[PDB]
Symmetry: D2
Subunit: 346 residues, 4 copies
């Protein structure tokens, strides 16, 4: 269940190439990998058809959500010699699995980030929004120390709907219960851990009607898609703070502006937005504005305009503790592959 | 009783009425008092004659009084000062004593507000919410150096366990932290949560996060200094939502740069006189240079520093308490009831 | 000569800068001068009770209701620290015996140099650079700028300010062209050609609007004329928001048809400009929220200043001294002209 | 040049520090001339020099390392030519290149208009408080205080140094309508023909509303601006420096800023730029940022009347074109065995 011991010499002969190695990937990943693998190539640019020829000679490609593997790039990784792709994340969506089947490449993945990391990020948003912390930081940096219109709100007895009670939502429910909020939950299947905290399960319509704060933790499924829309928003409680760290597909962004301007939605925290492909995990600040105009998302940039909206760039999973897990699971995954163990993260 | 008809005839003026003071306060006051004068500018000698017919002056922290303004406020006729805050410190009770002017005030903010704000600072710093917000607004959606930290199993020292420290201890335990406390007197609501009381030195040595809730006393002045900081745990997040006097600000720069203090949240800074509760951006820079605080401005420069402008008390709920305590304060004064607030 | 000194003046909308430039010179003349921080409406007009002259600004509105309360308050004169009388009615003033005076021109170098400052800031991405550097991003991408030296610049409108804009731009080294119904001989003596608007729109790298707002000029820049411009054009409007049809800006920004935009003015400034909306709760800000304006501020190649083109030591001085002379002339029964 | 183009095309070129702007201005032109061109995003090290294996010419920038040790590894990689996409050779070791057979070529001049227009840019922005204005408008503060600006038309402007760049600064500023005065050890006949008088340094400092530094950094010009000379200036003076950080003693700035002696400061440059400029430090954890933290620079950025750009005065479409075409011509001449002339050597 641990060490190698010297089967590690075999693991060490594995040659790993890692795409999209940005500063944080260097910080958490590069160090642990070179302790195990003798040869590891860290490529800063993402993975495409032009940087896939970079992988010639390597056995395994380490990838992230922003890296592309569709049918064209899988063919040149297979011809490069890499027979395993390991994701440092749990998203496999952007990889083509039908292409991997033809080319013999096996893909392994990290199914779980540490659930406290994500749950605590949702809670961070609530606190920031309640206390208008981003507003105040900026004003104070400019040298505006006046109090208007920074007046905030107490969380202590507020009613909190937790939508979806899986691993992360459970953590959200625990934390929000501990802050002292009155917590309610909705899920298709009740979580006994949540019930044992004394948080009642109610129907979704009831949860939307009674909540000061609603936090989305459910997965994105056809049944959950645009859970928040023009209709369900009119069912919520006027002034509601809506938090989403799960999936952008859970919210229909078009409906948000009217709801915000009517005061129907009083506040919005988001770690996610419905179309993030090409948008997130990119610093667009580095491109000339004429080039930024090519992929420009106007309704997103408009959304960012509101003082009661707060958006982070998909950092809810991004934590020392979560990265450590991602790293050790990616490495255990490399080893299981090379040592012929059953993978299970495939 | 219809003593409210006696109460209603009370004439009230409030200084330093900014937008937020209008919102929470003016509405509730005119429900009670028939004649109510709201002055946007603060309290001085030149705006004390604005108080010439009124019975009671409602005041704030950044306002005065001097020993002397009690007199033309007195000759204005106001024998009562009603504070919308808990500081009477900046007014002298010795000048008011001579002029028959009585001092009343709101001694308590709802302590969850203050405690929850300290928790807000901790969360914001852990997750780089201010860095993240600004980048996202510019169109930088990249991840480096937004990497945060989990709070769940971290060790948190609460320094001072009075009303606000109690809520802070309570909240941080509910979140899952390992909470320790220091105070002269253990708070039994805190001991009943199974939070151990340890020595200040032990608490500084073990804490990942230290949050100061003690009052400013000679014993606690510059509690945090060059010496005590070296007693702490490398990388510590220090939070001060109480009094600027608890920290020796000069000592922060070396400690931030060595990594000894890993992050700092502040709702208070030691010299707030003339600094806080003013929007300095409305002044030409040459006028700003006159009161410029160089070490405060340097301090804002660090990415791991987060400073709010004394907003920890500032909440719907807390403003409500203040309002209703202030209105009860006016009423008790008028009806010759005992004040209890002074 | 000591008769003028006896004048009693109230000034509405006194913010900090109004204090700095104005109150000092005024109290050198008039013995009693009342400065009210809040603007002019119905309710703060009774503050003018007894005063003979009220000095006002653009954010102050005087319709029939606020005019009646000052009139019975006693003020027979309104003096503007600005050139707009638009928000006041002159027909109500006719009925209540109150006369309208104003400062009709700011120092045109101030206004023109501001248009030039906008061009320079956008060319060199100064706002981007400032903020990044404040954050500690000292990297070079995507701060790459543009030279102004040989660029083609259209000046639309040749009056006192456009003249200065033309002069400055020629001195910078640009190839300057102009459109106006009346050629300005000062502009022609600089060897700047007057051409038709279509020709100017087709050839300009930088187009800067200096014409007044007239029925002929309204939405001068619109969906159709924009397609007549040169792809990548930098558009500057320091005159009037009505000269531009704002709705049309977004597709054109996004198509690259307009490459950059500076604005000191926007078509709907009513209730919007000269207010710091950040002192309000967001639930209150949502009431006057201008979504297309907030969207517009979103673009990296857009730069908007809050109607500061006139706001200058020199221009504030002119405004002050013309205001003091307007008051004096009224009191002395001289012909106004303002 | 047809056959010479095929011979030039056979050149193998590697470029270090290829960030977005280098891809934009450089890569396109290079791939039209050289058949094989390698663009590496990280800067040059001892470790990234091993990337140059097989390559003929390394294209480098001011931020790239050639100290005595990396020249050793580039030599053995096979590169005989180093082309700087810049005019600074300060960081390359020419004593090491001499020993290892490596020749260094360079771009000695950017368009002097680009730089001169940048200083003028700073002047306008500060005069009109454009950075303050932009930020407030973005937050939704549309109020006028303390944004009040100043007219440039009749102001007295000292230009210090009248070379290619100072000459342009003088031309532009006279054109704006300023009364321009100049100082140089040697008068520039083009400046005199603009009708701009030459005065002593003390005379210019005493009379100027605006001082703009364009002289090179010399033992005579070292800390030209210091505690003493600053008290000779005119109270409220705006100081602009786009030339060299060494011209100003940064310690002296704070007292003068706070006393009002220096009324405003625009800078494209600062005294120790090494490891500081051309890096985005926001990509690092704050704890790593604390290692090189420059307390006095960060403090300087705190002032409302100070404006700092990150060495962008040369950074222009037009200037980069000069740089690209001169660099490609530098390569071609080398390949075609022509006399170089942009060669720096020891
Ligand atoms: N850092 C980030 O922003 C990031 C990255 C990747 C994933 N995520 C999010 O984390 C989520 C996983 O959270 P988890 O750990 O708690 O997973 P989980 O499996 O443990 O919990 C999911 C729960 O949702 C419930 N559910 C199923 N259908 C539903 C419906 N129609 N309505 C409501 N609830 C329903 C399930 O019963 C289950 O209890 C992902 O789905 C994704 O949303 C976030
Ligand atoms: N919005 C703001 O930022 C704001 C405004 C006003 C006041 N405050 C701060 O909040 C404080 C009040 O908090 P509170 O309501 O809980 O008051 P409190 O009286 O209930 O708590 C004070 C506790 O500190 C203890 N104490 C006394 N001497 C001590 C020592 N040497 N060391 C350690 N502990 C000691 C006391 O026994 C007491 O239990 C104020 O003193 C002020 O510092 C903040
Ligand atoms: N600080 C500010 O931002 C601010 C404040 C108030 C007014 N303004 C603007 O400044 C302007 C005043 O500038 P000015 O001193 O140069 O005015 P001006 O009267 O002296 O010149 C206006 C010129 O526009 C010309 N013109 C008339 N119809 C035209 C048309 N259809 N097309 C093109 N040109 C036409 C006129 O012939 C005239 O020569 C105001 O009209 C206003 O737009 C700016
Ligand atoms: N993007 C940037 O910010 C950037 C990049 C590279 C270089 N630069 C600057 O541009 C400079 C080159 O400018 P240039 O093209 O005009 O070269 P230049 O030779 O034509 O200008 C320098 C002038 O200063 C004069 N001079 C010499 N000693 C002097 C003294 N003691 N005092 C005053 N003046 C003196 C020289 O005679 C010369 O005329 C570089 O030295 C550098 O400072 C800026």
């Amino acid at each position: 269940v641990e060490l190698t011991p010297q089967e590690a010499a075999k693991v060490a002969t594995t040659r790993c190439i890692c795409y999209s190695t940005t500063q944080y990937v260097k910080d958490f990943l590069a160090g642990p990998m070179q302790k195990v693998f003798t040869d590891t190539y860290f490529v800063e640019p993402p993975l495409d058809k032009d940087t896939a020829q970079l992988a010639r000679g390597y056995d395994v490609a380490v990838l992230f959500v922003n890296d592309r593997a569709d049918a064209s790039v899988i063919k040149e990784l297979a011809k490069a010699g890499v027979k395993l792709i390991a994701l440092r994340c749990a998203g496999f969506d952007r990889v083509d699995l039908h292409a991997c089947a033809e080319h013999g490449v096996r893909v392994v993945r990290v199914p779980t980030y540490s659930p406290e990391s994500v749950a605590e990020h949702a809670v961070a948003l609530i606190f920031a929004l309640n206390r208008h912390l981003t507003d105040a930081y900026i004003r104070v940096r400019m040298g505006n120390y006046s109090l208007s219109g920074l007046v905030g709100v107490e969380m202590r007895h507020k009613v909190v709907g937790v939508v979806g009670t899986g691993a992360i939502g459970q953590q959200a429910a625990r934390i929000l219960k501990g802050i002292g909020c009155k917590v309610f939950a909705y899920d298709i299947k009740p979580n006994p851990a949540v019930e044992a905290m004394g948080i009642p399960y109610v129907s979704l319509d009831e949860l939307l009607a009674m909540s000061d704060i609603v936090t989305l933790h459910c997965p994105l499924l056809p049944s959950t898609r645009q859970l928040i829309n023009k209709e369900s928003i009119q069912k919520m409680k006027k002034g509601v703070m809506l938090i989403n760290v799960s999936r952008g597909g859970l919210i229909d962004s078009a409906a948000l502006f009217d709801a915000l301007e009517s005061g129907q939605i009083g506040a919005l925290g988001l770690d996610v937005y419905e179309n993030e492909g090409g948008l997130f995990f990119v610093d667009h600040t580095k491109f000339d504005p004429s080039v930024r105009m090519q992929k420009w998302d106007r309704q997103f940039r408009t959304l960012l305009s509101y003082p009661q909206v707060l958006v982070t760039p998909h950092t809810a999973f991004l934590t020392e503790e979560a990265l450590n897990n991602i790293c050790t699971t990616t490495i255990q995954n490399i080893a299981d592959y090379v040592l012929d163990r059953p993978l299970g993260n495939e």
